[PDB]
JSON list of C-alpha atoms in Angstrom, two decimals:
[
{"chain": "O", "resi": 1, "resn": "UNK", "atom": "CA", "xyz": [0.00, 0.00, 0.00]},
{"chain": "O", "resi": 2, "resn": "UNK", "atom": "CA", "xyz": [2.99, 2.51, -0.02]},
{"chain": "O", "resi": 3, "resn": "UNK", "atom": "CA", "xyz": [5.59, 1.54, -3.05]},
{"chain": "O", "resi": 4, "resn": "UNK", "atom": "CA", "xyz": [8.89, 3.77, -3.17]},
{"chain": "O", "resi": 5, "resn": "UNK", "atom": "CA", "xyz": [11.04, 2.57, -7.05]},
{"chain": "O", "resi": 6, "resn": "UNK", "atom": "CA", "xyz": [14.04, 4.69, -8.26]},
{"chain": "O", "resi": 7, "resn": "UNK", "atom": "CA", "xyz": [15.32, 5.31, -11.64]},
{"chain": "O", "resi": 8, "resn": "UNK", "atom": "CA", "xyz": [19.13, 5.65, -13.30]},
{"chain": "O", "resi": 9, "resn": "UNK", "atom": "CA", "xyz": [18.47, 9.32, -13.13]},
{"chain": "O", "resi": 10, "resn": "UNK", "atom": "CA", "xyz": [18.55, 10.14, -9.60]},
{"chain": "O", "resi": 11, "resn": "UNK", "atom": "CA", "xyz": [14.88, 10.33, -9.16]},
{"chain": "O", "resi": 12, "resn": "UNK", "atom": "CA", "xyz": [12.45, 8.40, -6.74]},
{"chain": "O", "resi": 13, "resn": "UNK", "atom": "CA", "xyz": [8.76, 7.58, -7.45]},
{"chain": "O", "resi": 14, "resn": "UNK", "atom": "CA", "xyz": [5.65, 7.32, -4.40]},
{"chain": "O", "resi": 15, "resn": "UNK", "atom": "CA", "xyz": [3.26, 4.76, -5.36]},
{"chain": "O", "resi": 16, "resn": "UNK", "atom": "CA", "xyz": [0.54, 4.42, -2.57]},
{"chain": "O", "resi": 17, "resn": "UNK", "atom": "CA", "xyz": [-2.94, 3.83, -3.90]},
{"chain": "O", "resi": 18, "resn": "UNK", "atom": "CA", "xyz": [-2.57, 4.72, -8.09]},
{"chain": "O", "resi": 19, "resn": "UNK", "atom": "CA", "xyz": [-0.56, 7.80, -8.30]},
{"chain": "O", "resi": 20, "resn": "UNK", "atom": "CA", "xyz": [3.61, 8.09, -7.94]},
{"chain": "O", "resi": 21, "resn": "UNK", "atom": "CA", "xyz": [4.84, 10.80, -6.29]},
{"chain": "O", "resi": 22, "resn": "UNK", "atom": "CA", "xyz": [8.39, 11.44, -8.18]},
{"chain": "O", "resi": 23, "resn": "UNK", "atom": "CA", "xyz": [11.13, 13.79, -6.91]},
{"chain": "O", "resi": 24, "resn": "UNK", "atom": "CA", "xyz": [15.09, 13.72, -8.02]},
{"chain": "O", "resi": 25, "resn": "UNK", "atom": "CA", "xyz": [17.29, 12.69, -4.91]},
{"chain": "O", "resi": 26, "resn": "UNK", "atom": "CA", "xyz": [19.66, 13.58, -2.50]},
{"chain": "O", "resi": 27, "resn": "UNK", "atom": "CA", "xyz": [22.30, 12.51, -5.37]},
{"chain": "O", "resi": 28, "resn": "UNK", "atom": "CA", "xyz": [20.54, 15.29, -7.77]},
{"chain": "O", "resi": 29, "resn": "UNK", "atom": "CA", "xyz": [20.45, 18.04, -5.33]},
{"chain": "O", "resi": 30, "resn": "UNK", "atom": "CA", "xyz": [24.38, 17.64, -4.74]},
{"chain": "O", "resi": 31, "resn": "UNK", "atom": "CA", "xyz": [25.41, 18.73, -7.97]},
{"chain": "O", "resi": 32, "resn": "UNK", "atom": "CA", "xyz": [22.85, 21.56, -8.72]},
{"chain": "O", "resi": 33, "resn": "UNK", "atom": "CA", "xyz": [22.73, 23.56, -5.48]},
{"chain": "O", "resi": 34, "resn": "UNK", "atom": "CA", "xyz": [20.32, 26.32, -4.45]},
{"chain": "O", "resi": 35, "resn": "UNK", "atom": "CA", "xyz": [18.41, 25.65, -8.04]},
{"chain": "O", "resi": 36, "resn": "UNK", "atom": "CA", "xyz": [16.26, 28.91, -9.94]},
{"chain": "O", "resi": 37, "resn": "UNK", "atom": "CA", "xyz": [13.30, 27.03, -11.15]},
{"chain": "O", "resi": 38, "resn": "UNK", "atom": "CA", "xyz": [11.47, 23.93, -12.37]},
{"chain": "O", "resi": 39, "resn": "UNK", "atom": "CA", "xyz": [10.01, 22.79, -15.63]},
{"chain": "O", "resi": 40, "resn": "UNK", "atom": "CA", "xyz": [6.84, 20.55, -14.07]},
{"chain": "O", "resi": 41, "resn": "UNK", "atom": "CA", "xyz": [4.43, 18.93, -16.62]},
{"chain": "O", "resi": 42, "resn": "UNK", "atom": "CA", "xyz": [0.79, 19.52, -17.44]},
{"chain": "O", "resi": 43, "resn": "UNK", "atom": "CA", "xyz": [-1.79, 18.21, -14.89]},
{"chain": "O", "resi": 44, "resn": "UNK", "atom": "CA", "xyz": [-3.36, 15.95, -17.83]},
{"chain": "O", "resi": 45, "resn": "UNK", "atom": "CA", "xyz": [0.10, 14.78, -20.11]},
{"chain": "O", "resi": 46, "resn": "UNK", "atom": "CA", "xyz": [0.76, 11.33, -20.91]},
{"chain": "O", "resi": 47, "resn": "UNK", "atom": "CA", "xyz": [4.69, 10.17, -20.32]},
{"chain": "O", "resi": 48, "resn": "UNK", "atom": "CA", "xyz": [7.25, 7.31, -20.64]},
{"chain": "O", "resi": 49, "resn": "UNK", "atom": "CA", "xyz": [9.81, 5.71, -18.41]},
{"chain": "O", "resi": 50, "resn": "UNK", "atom": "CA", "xyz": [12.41, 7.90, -20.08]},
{"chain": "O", "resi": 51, "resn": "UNK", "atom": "CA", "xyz": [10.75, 11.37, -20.81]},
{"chain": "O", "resi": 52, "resn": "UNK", "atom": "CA", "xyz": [12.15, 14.87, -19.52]},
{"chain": "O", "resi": 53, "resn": "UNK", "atom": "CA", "xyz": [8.75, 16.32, -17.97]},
{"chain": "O", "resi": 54, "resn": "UNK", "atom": "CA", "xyz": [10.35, 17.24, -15.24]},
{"chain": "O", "resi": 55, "resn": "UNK", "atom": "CA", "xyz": [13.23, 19.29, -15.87]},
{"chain": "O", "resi": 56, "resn": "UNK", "atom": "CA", "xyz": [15.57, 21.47, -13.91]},
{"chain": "O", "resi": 57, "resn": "UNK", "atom": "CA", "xyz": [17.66, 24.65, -14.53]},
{"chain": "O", "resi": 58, "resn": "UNK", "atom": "CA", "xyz": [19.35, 26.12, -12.02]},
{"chain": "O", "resi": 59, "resn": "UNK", "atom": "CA", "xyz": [21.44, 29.58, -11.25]},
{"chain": "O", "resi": 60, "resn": "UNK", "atom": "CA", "xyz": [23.58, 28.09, -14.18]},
{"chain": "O", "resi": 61, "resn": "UNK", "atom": "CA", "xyz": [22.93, 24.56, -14.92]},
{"chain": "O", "resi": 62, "resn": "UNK", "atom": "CA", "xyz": [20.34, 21.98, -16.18]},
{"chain": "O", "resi": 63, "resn": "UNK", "atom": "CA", "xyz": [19.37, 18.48, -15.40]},
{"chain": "O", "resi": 64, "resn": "UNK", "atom": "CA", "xyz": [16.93, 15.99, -17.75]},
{"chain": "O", "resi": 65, "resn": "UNK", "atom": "CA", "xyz": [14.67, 14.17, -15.13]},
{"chain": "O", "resi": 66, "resn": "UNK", "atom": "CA", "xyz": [13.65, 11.64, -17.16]},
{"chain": "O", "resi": 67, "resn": "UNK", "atom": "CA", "xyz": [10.94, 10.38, -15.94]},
{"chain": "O", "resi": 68, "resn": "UNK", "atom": "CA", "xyz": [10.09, 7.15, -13.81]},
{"chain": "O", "resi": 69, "resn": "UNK", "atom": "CA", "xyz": [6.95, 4.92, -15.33]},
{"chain": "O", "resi": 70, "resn": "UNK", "atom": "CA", "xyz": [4.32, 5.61, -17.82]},
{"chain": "O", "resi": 71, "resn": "UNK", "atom": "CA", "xyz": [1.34, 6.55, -16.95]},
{"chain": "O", "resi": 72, "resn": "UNK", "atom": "CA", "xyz": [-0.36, 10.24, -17.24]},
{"chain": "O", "resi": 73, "resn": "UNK", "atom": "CA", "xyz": [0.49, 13.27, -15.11]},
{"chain": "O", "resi": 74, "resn": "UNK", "atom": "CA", "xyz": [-2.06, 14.28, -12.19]},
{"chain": "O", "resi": 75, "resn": "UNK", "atom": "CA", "xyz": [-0.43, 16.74, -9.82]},
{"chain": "O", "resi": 76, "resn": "UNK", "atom": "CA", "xyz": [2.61, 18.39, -9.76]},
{"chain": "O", "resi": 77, "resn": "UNK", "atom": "CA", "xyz": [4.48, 20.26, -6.98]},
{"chain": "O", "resi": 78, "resn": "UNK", "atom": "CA", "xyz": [3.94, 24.28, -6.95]},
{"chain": "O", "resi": 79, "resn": "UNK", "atom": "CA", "xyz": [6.08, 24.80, -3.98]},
{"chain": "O", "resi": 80, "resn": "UNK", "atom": "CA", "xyz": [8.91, 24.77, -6.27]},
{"chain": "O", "resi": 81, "resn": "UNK", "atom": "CA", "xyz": [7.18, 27.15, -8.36]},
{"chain": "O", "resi": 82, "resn": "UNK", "atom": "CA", "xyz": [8.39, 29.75, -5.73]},
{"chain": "O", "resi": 83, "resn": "UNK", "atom": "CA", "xyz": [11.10, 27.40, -4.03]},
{"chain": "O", "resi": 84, "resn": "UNK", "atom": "CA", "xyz": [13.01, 25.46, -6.03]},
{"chain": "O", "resi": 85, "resn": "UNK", "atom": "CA", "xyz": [14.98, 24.87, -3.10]},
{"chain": "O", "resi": 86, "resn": "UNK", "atom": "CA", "xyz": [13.02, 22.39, -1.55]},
{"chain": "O", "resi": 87, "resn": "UNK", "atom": "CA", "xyz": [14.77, 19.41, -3.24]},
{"chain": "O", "resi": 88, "resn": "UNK", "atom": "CA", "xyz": [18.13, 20.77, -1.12]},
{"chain": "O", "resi": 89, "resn": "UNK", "atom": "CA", "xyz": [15.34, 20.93, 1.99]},
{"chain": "O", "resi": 90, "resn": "UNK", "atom": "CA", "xyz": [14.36, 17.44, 1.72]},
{"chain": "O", "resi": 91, "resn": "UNK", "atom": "CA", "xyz": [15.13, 15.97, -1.68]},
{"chain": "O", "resi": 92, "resn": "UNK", "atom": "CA", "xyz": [12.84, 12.56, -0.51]},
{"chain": "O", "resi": 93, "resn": "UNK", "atom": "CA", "xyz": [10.22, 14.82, 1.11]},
{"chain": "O", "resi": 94, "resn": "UNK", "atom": "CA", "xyz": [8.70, 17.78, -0.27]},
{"chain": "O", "resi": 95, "resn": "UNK", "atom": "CA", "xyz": [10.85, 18.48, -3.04]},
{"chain": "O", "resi": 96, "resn": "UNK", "atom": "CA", "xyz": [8.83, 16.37, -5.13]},
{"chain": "O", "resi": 97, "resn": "UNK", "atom": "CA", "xyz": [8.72, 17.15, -8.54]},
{"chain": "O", "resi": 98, "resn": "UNK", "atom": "CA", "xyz": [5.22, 15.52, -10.03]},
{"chain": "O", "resi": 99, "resn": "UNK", "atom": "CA", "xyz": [2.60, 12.82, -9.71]},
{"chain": "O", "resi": 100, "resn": "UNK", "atom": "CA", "xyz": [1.33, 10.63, -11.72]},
{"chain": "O", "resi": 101, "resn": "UNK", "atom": "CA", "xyz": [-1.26, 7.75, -12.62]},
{"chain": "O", "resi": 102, "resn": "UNK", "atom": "CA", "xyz": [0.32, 4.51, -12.73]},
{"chain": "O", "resi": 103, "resn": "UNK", "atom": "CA", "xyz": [-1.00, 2.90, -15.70]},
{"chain": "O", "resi": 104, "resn": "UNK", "atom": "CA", "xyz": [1.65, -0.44, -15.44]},
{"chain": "O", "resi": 105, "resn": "UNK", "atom": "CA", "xyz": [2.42, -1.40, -11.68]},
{"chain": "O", "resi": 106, "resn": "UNK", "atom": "CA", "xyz": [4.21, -4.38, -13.28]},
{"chain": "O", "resi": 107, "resn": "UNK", "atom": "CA", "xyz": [7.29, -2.27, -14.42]},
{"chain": "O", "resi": 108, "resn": "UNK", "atom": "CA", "xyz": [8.07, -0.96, -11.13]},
{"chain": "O", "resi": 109, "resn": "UNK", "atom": "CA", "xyz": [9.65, -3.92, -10.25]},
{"chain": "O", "resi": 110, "resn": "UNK", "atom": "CA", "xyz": [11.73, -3.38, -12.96]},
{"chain": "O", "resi": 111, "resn": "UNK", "atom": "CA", "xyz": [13.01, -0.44, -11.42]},
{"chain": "O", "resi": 112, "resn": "UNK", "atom": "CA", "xyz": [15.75, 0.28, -8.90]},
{"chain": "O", "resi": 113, "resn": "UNK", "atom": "CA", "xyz": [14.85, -0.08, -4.81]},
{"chain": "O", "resi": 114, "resn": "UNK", "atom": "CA", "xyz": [16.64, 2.27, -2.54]},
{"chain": "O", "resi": 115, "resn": "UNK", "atom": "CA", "xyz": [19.50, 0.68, -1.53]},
{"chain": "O", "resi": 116, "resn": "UNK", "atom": "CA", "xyz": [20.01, -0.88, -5.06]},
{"chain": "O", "resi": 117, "resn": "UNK", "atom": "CA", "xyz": [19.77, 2.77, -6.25]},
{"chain": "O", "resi": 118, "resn": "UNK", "atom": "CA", "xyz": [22.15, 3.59, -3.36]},
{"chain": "O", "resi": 119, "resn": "UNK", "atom": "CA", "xyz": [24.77, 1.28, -4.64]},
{"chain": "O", "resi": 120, "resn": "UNK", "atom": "CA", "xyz": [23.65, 2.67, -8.66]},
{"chain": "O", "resi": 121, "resn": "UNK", "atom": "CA", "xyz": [25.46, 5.93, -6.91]},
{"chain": "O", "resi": 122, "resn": "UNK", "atom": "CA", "xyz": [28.05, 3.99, -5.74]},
{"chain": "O", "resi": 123, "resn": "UNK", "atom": "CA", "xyz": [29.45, 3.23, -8.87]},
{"chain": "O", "resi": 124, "resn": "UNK", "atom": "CA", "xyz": [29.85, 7.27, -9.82]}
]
Protein backbone atom coordinates (compact mmCIF):
# COMPACT_ATOMS: atom_id res chain seq x y z
CA UNK A 1 0.00 0.00 0.00
CA UNK A 2 2.99 2.51 -0.02
CA UNK A 3 5.59 1.54 -3.05
CA UNK A 4 8.89 3.77 -3.17
CA UNK A 5 11.04 2.57 -7.05
CA UNK A 6 14.04 4.69 -8.26
CA UNK A 7 15.32 5.31 -11.64
CA UNK A 8 19.13 5.65 -13.30
CA UNK A 9 18.47 9.32 -13.13
CA UNK A 10 18.55 10.14 -9.60
CA UNK A 11 14.88 10.33 -9.16
CA UNK A 12 12.45 8.40 -6.74
CA UNK A 13 8.76 7.58 -7.45
CA UNK A 14 5.65 7.32 -4.40
CA UNK A 15 3.26 4.76 -5.36
CA UNK A 16 0.54 4.42 -2.57
CA UNK A 17 -2.94 3.83 -3.90
CA UNK A 18 -2.57 4.72 -8.09
CA UNK A 19 -0.56 7.80 -8.30
CA UNK A 20 3.61 8.09 -7.94
CA UNK A 21 4.84 10.80 -6.29
CA UNK A 22 8.39 11.44 -8.18
CA UNK A 23 11.13 13.79 -6.91
CA UNK A 24 15.09 13.72 -8.02
CA UNK A 25 17.29 12.69 -4.91
CA UNK A 26 19.66 13.58 -2.50
CA UNK A 27 22.30 12.51 -5.37
CA UNK A 28 20.54 15.29 -7.77
CA UNK A 29 20.45 18.04 -5.33
CA UNK A 30 24.38 17.64 -4.74
CA UNK A 31 25.41 18.73 -7.97
CA UNK A 32 22.85 21.56 -8.72
CA UNK A 33 22.73 23.56 -5.48
CA UNK A 34 20.32 26.32 -4.45
CA UNK A 35 18.41 25.65 -8.04
CA UNK A 36 16.26 28.91 -9.94
CA UNK A 37 13.30 27.03 -11.15
CA UNK A 38 11.47 23.93 -12.37
CA UNK A 39 10.01 22.79 -15.63
CA UNK A 40 6.84 20.55 -14.07
CA UNK A 41 4.43 18.93 -16.62
CA UNK A 42 0.79 19.52 -17.44
CA UNK A 43 -1.79 18.21 -14.89
CA UNK A 44 -3.36 15.95 -17.83
CA UNK A 45 0.10 14.78 -20.11
CA UNK A 46 0.76 11.33 -20.91
CA UNK A 47 4.69 10.17 -20.32
CA UNK A 48 7.25 7.31 -20.64
CA UNK A 49 9.81 5.71 -18.41
CA UNK A 50 12.41 7.90 -20.08
CA UNK A 51 10.75 11.37 -20.81
CA UNK A 52 12.15 14.87 -19.52
CA UNK A 53 8.75 16.32 -17.97
CA UNK A 54 10.35 17.24 -15.24
CA UNK A 55 13.23 19.29 -15.87
CA UNK A 56 15.57 21.47 -13.91
CA UNK A 57 17.66 24.65 -14.53
CA UNK A 58 19.35 26.12 -12.02
CA UNK A 59 21.44 29.58 -11.25
CA UNK A 60 23.58 28.09 -14.18
CA UNK A 61 22.93 24.56 -14.92
CA UNK A 62 20.34 21.98 -16.18
CA UNK A 63 19.37 18.48 -15.40
CA UNK A 64 16.93 15.99 -17.75
CA UNK A 65 14.67 14.17 -15.13
CA UNK A 66 13.65 11.64 -17.16
CA UNK A 67 10.94 10.38 -15.94
CA UNK A 68 10.09 7.15 -13.81
CA UNK A 69 6.95 4.92 -15.33
CA UNK A 70 4.32 5.61 -17.82
CA UNK A 71 1.34 6.55 -16.95
CA UNK A 72 -0.36 10.24 -17.24
CA UNK A 73 0.49 13.27 -15.11
CA UNK A 74 -2.06 14.28 -12.19
CA UNK A 75 -0.43 16.74 -9.82
CA UNK A 76 2.61 18.39 -9.76
CA UNK A 77 4.48 20.26 -6.98
CA UNK A 78 3.94 24.28 -6.95
CA UNK A 79 6.08 24.80 -3.98
CA UNK A 80 8.91 24.77 -6.27
CA UNK A 81 7.18 27.15 -8.36
CA UNK A 82 8.39 29.75 -5.73
CA UNK A 83 11.10 27.40 -4.03
CA UNK A 84 13.01 25.46 -6.03
CA UNK A 85 14.98 24.87 -3.10
CA UNK A 86 13.02 22.39 -1.55
CA UNK A 87 14.77 19.41 -3.24
CA UNK A 88 18.13 20.77 -1.12
CA UNK A 89 15.34 20.93 1.99
CA UNK A 90 14.36 17.44 1.72
CA UNK A 91 15.13 15.97 -1.68
CA UNK A 92 12.84 12.56 -0.51
CA UNK A 93 10.22 14.82 1.11
CA UNK A 94 8.70 17.78 -0.27
CA UNK A 95 10.85 18.48 -3.04
CA UNK A 96 8.83 16.37 -5.13
CA UNK A 97 8.72 17.15 -8.54
CA UNK A 98 5.22 15.52 -10.03
CA UNK A 99 2.60 12.82 -9.71
CA UNK A 100 1.33 10.63 -11.72
CA UNK A 101 -1.26 7.75 -12.62
CA UNK A 102 0.32 4.51 -12.73
CA UNK A 103 -1.00 2.90 -15.70
CA UNK A 104 1.65 -0.44 -15.44
CA UNK A 105 2.42 -1.40 -11.68
CA UNK A 106 4.21 -4.38 -13.28
CA UNK A 107 7.29 -2.27 -14.42
CA UNK A 108 8.07 -0.96 -11.13
CA UNK A 109 9.65 -3.92 -10.25
CA UNK A 110 11.73 -3.38 -12.96
CA UNK A 111 13.01 -0.44 -11.42
CA UNK A 112 15.75 0.28 -8.90
CA UNK A 113 14.85 -0.08 -4.81
CA UNK A 114 16.64 2.27 -2.54
CA UNK A 115 19.50 0.68 -1.53
CA UNK A 116 20.01 -0.88 -5.06
CA UNK A 117 19.77 2.77 -6.25
CA UNK A 118 22.15 3.59 -3.36
CA UNK A 119 24.77 1.28 -4.64
CA UNK A 120 23.65 2.67 -8.66
CA UNK A 121 25.46 5.93 -6.91
CA UNK A 122 28.05 3.99 -5.74
CA UNK A 123 29.45 3.23 -8.87
CA UNK A 124 29.85 7.27 -9.82
Amino acid sequence: MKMKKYTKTHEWVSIEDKVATVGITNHAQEQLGDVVYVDLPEVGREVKKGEVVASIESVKAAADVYAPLSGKIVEVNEKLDTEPELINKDPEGEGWLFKMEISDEGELEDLLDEQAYQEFCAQE
